Every structure is written in C-alpha cells, then in structure tokens.
Amino acid sequence: AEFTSPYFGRPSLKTRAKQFEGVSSP
Amino acid sequence: AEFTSPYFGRPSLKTRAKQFEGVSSP
Amino acid sequence: NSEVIKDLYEYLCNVRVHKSYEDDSGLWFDISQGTYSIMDYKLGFVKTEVIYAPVLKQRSTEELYSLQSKLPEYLFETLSFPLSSLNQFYNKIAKSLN
Amino acid sequence: NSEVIKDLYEYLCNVRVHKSYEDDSGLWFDISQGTYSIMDYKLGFVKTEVIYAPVLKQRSTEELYSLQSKLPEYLFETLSFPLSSLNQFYNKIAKSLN
Helix, strand or coil, X not given: CXXXXXXXXXXXXXXXXXXXXXXXXX | CCCCCCCCCCCCHHHHXXXXXXXXXX | CHHHHHHHHHHHHCEEEEEEEECCCCEEEEEEECCCCCEEEEXXXXXXXXXXXXXXXXXXXXXXXXXXXXXXXXXXXXXXXXXXHHHHHHHHHHHHHC | CHHHHXXXXXXXXXXXXXXXXXXXXXXXXXXXXXXXXXXXXXXXXECXXXXXXXXXXXXXXXXXXXXXXXXXXXXXXCEEEEHHXXXXXXXXXXXXXX
C-alpha cells in the first residue's frame, strides 16, 4: 500500500500525555 | 466479584446509534 | 478503557461518536449531541473539508418541531464548511440545544 | 477506530483524554484541553462528585503567566464540584482559553 495523508493531520494533543509523568492523584 | 455501580450511570447516547440504521452518506 | 473514555467525552462535552467508517467519499462519523433535546448527524471528512448531514427521517413530528423552533435552519439540511470551523460548529449546536 | 474517534473528539471539542485509570479513590482521567493556549489536568470521579486537579509543575514560567492572566484563578488549584456541572466546567475552560 502507498502512503496516504491522514484526515486529521495536525499535531494533536497526544504529545502532551508526557506532562502527567510524575503526578499523582490529589 | 460483586456488582458495583458504574461511575457514569445515566442512560447514555449509545441508545441513539440505531437512528442511523438506513441512512447513507449524502 | 475505550468505553469509559467515550462515557467521559459524553458527560464532559454532551456528544457521542457512535461509530466511524470510511467509504469512497471519505471518513464518516455517526454522532449524537445533546444537552432534553438531542440531534443526530453524520460528519464526513473529504481530502480537508467537512460535510454535515442531519439524520432526521426517524424523528417524530413533535421532536422535529421542538428542534426547528430553536436550532438554526441550516442545521436541518446538508452543509459543507472548512475544517477550521468544526469546533465553532460544535459550540453552535451545543448553545442552540441548551 | 478508537484512535481516529479520539482525533475527532479533539478537532470537534478541543479536548483529548490521554488515558484513564482507577485507583483506590476512584476513576481518573488525564486530560488536555486547548484552543495556542493549552491546559493539562486530571478529573477524578468518586462515588457522583468530580475532582479537578491542574497539572502545572512542568509548565514554564512564560506558559503559566499567559494562562493565569486569562483563566479563572480557581482553575490553578484543586477543585471539587458536582457531576451536573461538568459540561459547564468544560465550557468555561474552553471559553477562557480561546
């Protein structure tokens, strides 16, 4: 199969998951 | 295991999926 | 976790994506959005530009009358608009239903 | 389809649930919400009542300054509120970020 551009191509909020690395519940 | 009340217990919008039975894309 | 994460999106945003599928035209979503006034519609993504298609054939006459009185008239026909307007489109539906 | 359905929720509602987990206290969600101003927070559900916990320790001083100027002050501390206020809470964050 050939590469196809994703419908939602912009950088998502998936990158931000790392912000919760060391946090615990309050 | 014993039954436990779900956190989100109200009737959801999952029931409405049937509304799209016979519809096709425009 | 996928089912409880969708439950959160419903409580947080009053919207539920029933399912997705990709036809020849593009990627499509069956969607319901609520407040008790509820609207069912499809969103198509063609490559991007967005197609909105109301799902009204099943709704009763009383249901259609309530929605029509408050919702913008264009929400009862098919509509095409740019992807950059999708969040406003969501908010307009949300504001109109509540 | 779960990954593209989450992409739709992000474009439609400017919110992303990174993951869920259930500890002794209850069911928890890591959440980011955006417009480019972005806020990261946890929502806890205890059985129901909702606990909001901002995730700010990682953010830079410039980032914190911008958010603080526009967002309501209580959004920078832990907060507890009823489940029936969750959608308004989402909308208040959305309106403040945009």
